[PDB]
Ligand binder design. Structure first.
Ligand SMILES: CN1CN([C@@H]2O[C@H](COP(=O)(O)OP(=O)(O)OP(=O)(O)O)[C@@H](O)[C@H]2O)c2nc(N)[nH]c(=O)c21
Ligand SMILES: CN1CN([C@@H]2O[C@H](COP(=O)(O)OP(=O)(O)OP(=O)(O)O)[C@@H](O)[C@H]2O)c2nc(N)[nH]c(=O)c21
Ligand SMILES: Nc1ncnc2c1ncn2[C@@H]1O[C@H](CSCC[C@H](N)C(=O)O)[C@@H](O)[C@H]1O
Ligand SMILES: Nc1ncnc2c1ncn2[C@@H]1O[C@H](CSCC[C@H](N)C(=O)O)[C@@H](O)[C@H]1O
Lengths: 291, 291
C-alpha cells in the first residue's frame, strides 16, 4: 500500500513543491472512481469559494451568476446550504442546455436557457443592476483554440458583469499545443479534490477590490510548469494514503476534501472539526447519491 | 492681467483640485497660440516620460516602438537628445502616413509605412524578439466609437508587445456621448503643457513590473469628472500668469514646461536648474522653429 504522513494537503497550485515529466500513457488510465464524481468536484470547490465570500461578508445580498450551469444537480445542494443558513442570495443559472428539474420551483433561482455572448452579458448586466454580482463560470466548448476562446469569454464576463468575486474554470493549454500567450484574471489557483485522475484543471478564485482589474500573462513556459506540477500532484500525491489522517477514508482526496469542508459554516454545533466534516461529507454524498 | 503665485503646477490629473461646468462655447475659442505647438506638446511629454525611464535604468538598450509617429518631426529632437547622451536606443516608427525626411538616414531609426493591426503587432513582436520594448502610442482615427476602438488597439499593443513601459494617448470620451464603460491600463495621467486651449487629452504613462497587467475601468461618471477637472484646468489655471515665477515667460504653460524640463539630463553642467531649463527650452524652440 502507498502510505504517507502529511500535515496538510496542497490547497493551491503554488504550493505544489515538485514536478514530473508528463507521461502521455496516463491518458489511458481510469479518470474516475466515484459515481457523479464531477458533481462532487464542483460542489466542493464552489462550497469552498462561496464560504470564503461569506467569511468576507460579500455573499449575502449577492446575485450568483453561474454560466455553464447545466445540468447543475449539485447546485441544488449549494443553494439549500446557504438558504438554510439564512444567507439571502439569488441564483441565475445560464446555459443553453437544460438544468436538472430539482432546480425548478425555487423563487430564488432563475434558470435561463441561453448560450451567453458579450451582448447578452450586457443585457443581463443592465437587467441585474444594481445588484452585486458573484460570477461562477464552468463553460465548456478540447483544442487550445477552444480554450483560448473560453478564457476570452470569461474575461469579458468579468469586464461586463463587473462582479465582486469570481470562480473561473482554469486549465492551462498543453505546451505542445501552444498557440499564443494570453492573460487570465489574477486569483488563487484552487486545487480540486475528486478532479479526474490526470486532470490539470483548477478553479481561479478572485475577489475584486476597487475599480481595477488585474490580469496575468500565461506563456508556454508557464504551460510547461502547469503540466509538470499537475502531473506530479496527480501521479504521486493524489495516490497517497495519508495514514496519520484519522478519518473513515484516508485517501489523499478525502484528506484534501476535509480541508475544504472544515471551512464551511453549519447551523448545527459540533464538538470537533472532525464531526462537522464527517457530517458535511455524509450529507454531500447522500445528496449526490454517492455510496 | 490675470496674475497668481504658485508653488508648483499640476503635473498629473489627480492633482487637479477643482472643477468647472464645461461650457460648449469654449470649442469656438482659439486652440493654439504657437506655431508647431502640437510638436512641442508631444516633445515635452515624451522627453518627460523617457527621462523617467532613464532615471529608472530602463531606457538604455530598449527599442522604442512609436505607433502613430508621422510626421514625427519632434521625434528627431528626442532621438538626438538620447543619442548624444550616450544612451543606446533603437527607434521603430510605424504609421501609414509618411515621416518627416529629417528622420531618414539614421541607422538607429527604422521608419515603417504600415497601419498596425493585431496581427502585424504579433509579427513585429516576433521580429523584435528578444529586445526590451518601450511603447509610445499616438494613433488617431473623433467619435466615442473611434476612441474606444483606439483604446482597444492600445491595450492590444501592450498585451502583444508586452513592453517594459508605455506612453499612451488618453482623452476620456465625453459623458454626453457615452457608449460603454471600458478599461485602460493603469498609469500616471500626465498633464500636457501646450495642449490645445480646451483639450482634455493627457498621456497615460506606465511601467510594467512582473508579468501582471493592471487595468482600470472608466465609467460615465469618470467621464463627467474628467470633463470638469480638465475644463477647470484649461479655463482657469492655464490662463494664469505665475508672477512669482522668475522666468522670461511666466504664463502657466511655461511654468508647467519648466517642471518637466527640470527632470531632463544634459551633458552640459549648469549652475542652476533655471539655466538648464532656459537652455533646454531655447534648444527645443530653435529646433522646432518656434520664435
Ligand atoms: C493532463 N494531460 C492530458 N493530456 C491530453 O488531454 C487529452 C484529454 O484529457 P484531459 O486533458 O483530461 O481533458 P480535459 O479537457 O483537460 O478535461 P478535464 O480537465 O479532465 C488526453 O487524451 C491527453 O492526450 C495532456 N497532453 C499534454 N501534452 N500534457 C498534459 O499534461 C496532458
Ligand atoms: C473639451 N471638449 C470638447 N468638446 C467637443 O469636442 C469637439 C472637438 O474638440 P476637441 O475635444 O478639442 O477635439 P479632440 O479630438 O479632443 O482633440 P484634442 O484632444 O484637442 C468640440 O467641437 C466640442 O464639441 C467637448 N464636448 C463635451 N461634451 N465636453 C467637453 O469637455 C468637450
Ligand atoms: N456561451 C455559453 N453560455 C452558457 N453556457 C455555455 C456556453 N458555452 C458552453 N456552455 C455550457 O458549459 C457547460 C459545461 S458543463 C457544466 C457543468 C455544470 N457546471 C454542472 O454543475 O453540472 C455545458 O452545459 C455547456 O452548454
Ligand atoms: N493603426 C495605426 N497604425 C499606425 N499609425 C496609425 C494607426 N491609425 C492611425 N495612425 C496614425 O496616428 C497618427 C496620429 S497623428 C500622430 C502625430 C505624431 N505622433 C507626431 O509626432 O507628429 C496619424 O499619422 C495616423 O496615420
Amino acid at each position: 500500500m502507498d502510505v504517507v504522513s502529511l500535515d496538510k494537503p496542497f490547497m493551491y497550485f503554488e504550493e505544489i513543491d515538485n514536478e514530473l515529466d508528463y507521461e502521455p500513457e496516463s491518458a489511458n488510465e481510469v479518470a474516475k472512481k466515484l459515481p457523479y464524481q464531477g458533481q462532487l468536484k464542483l460542489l466542493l470547490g464552489e462550497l469552498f469559494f462561496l464560504s470564503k465570500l461569506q467569511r468576507h461578508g460579500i455573499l449575502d445580498g449577492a446575485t450568483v451568476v453561474y454560466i455553464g450551469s447545466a445540468p447543475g444537480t449539485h447546485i441544488r445542494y449549494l443553494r439549500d446550504h446557504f438558504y438554510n443558513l439564512g444567507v439571502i442570495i439569488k441564483w441565475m443559472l445560464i446555459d443553453g442546455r437544460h438544468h436538472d428539474p430539482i432546480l425548478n420551483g425555487l423563487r430564488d433561482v432563475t434558470l435561463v436557457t441561453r448560450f451567453v455572448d458579450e451582448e447578452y452579458l450586457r443585457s443581463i448586466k443592465k437587467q441585474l443592476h444594481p445588484s452585486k454580482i458573484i460570477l461562477i463560470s464552468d463553460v465548456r466548448s478540447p483544442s487550445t483554440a477552444d480554450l483560448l476562446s473560453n478564457y476570452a469569454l470569461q474575461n469579458v464576463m468579468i469586464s461586463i458583469l463587473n462582479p465582486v468575486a469570481s470562480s473561473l474554470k482554469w486549465r492551462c493549454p498543453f505546451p505542445d499545443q501552444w498557440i499564443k500567450d494570453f492573460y487570465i484574471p489574477h486569483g488563487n489557483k484552487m486545487l480540486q479534490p475528486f478532479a479526474p485522475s490526470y486532470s490539470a484543471e483548477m478553479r481561479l478564485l478572485s475577489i475584486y477590490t476597487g475599480e481595477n482589474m488585474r490580469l496575468t500573462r500565461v506563456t508556454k513556459s508557464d504551460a510547461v510548469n502547469y503540466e509538470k506540477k499537475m502531473y506530479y500532484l496527480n501521479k504521486i500525491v493524489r495516490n497517497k494514503v495519508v495514514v496519520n489522517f484519522d478519518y473513515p477514508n484516508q485517501e489523499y482526496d478525502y484528506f484534501h476534501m476535509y480541508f475544504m469542508l472544515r471551512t464551511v459554516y453549519c447551523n448545527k454545533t459540533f464538538p470537533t472539526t472532525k464531526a462537522k466534516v464527517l457530517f458535511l461529507q455524509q450529507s454531500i454524498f447522500r445528496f449526490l447519491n454517492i455510496p
